[PDB]
Ligand binder design. Structure first.
Ligand SMILES: [Zn+2]
Lengths: 117, 68
């Protein structure tokens, strides 16, 4: 299902579907336009974990756990330079919320099947 | 090049790390506590935050000076 989330996030990058940034996360949670978001667990965050769990469990938002902060920015594309191979200078992001428009996809059926149950 | 007169500085955005927790007050129970106001007009929503002065207030883009 990791390839399914990669395809969904890449298509959101193509059509500007994802609302990247904690600033735009606050905008989307204020306007209640949060289809999905990805949260990094067991990181070195000093006190941000409680606030971001409150944001991730505020109102009809799924709880998704990944491992590290800077690898999340590789999916969302903060420092996508030298795309032929591994990027060599990457800073990271905490969490990214999405606002999906083209929901009719191939693996989005099993994504929403796992989302409902 | 340069003259004898010194050059003028400009208001640059200084690098402050993790200011997002300055938006709301993180409490124990899951209810958001906010120390700031918003812009009540429909041109800018509540997602846009405001300018924290001490006696007067500023909207997002409306330039409406909210005073007491
Ligand atoms: Zn306004």
């Amino acid at each position: 299902v990791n390839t399914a989330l990669q395809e969904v996030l890449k298509t959101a990058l193509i059509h500007d579907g994802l609302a990247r940034g904690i600033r735009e996360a606050a905008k989307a949670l204020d306007k209640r336009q949060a289809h999905l978001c990805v949260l990094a667990s067991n990181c070195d965050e000093p006190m941000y974990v409680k606030l971001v769990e409150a944001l991730c469990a505020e109102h009809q938002i799924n709880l998704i756990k990944v491992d590290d902060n800077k690898k999340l920015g590789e999916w969302v594309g903060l420092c996508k330079i030298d795309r032929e191979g591994k990027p060599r200078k990457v800073v990271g992001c905490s969490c990214v919320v999405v606002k999906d428009y083209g929901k009719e996809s191939q693996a989005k059926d099993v994504i929403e099947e796992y989302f409902k149950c | 090049k340069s003259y004898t007169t010194p050059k003028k500085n400009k208001h640059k955005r200084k690098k402050v790390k993790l200011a997002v927790l300055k938006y709301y007050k993180v409490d124990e129970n899951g209810k958001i506590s906010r120390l700031r106001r918003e812009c009540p007009s429909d041109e800018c929503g509540a997602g846009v935050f405001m300018a924290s002065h001490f006696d007067r207030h500023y909207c997002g883009k409306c330039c409406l000076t909210y005073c007491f």
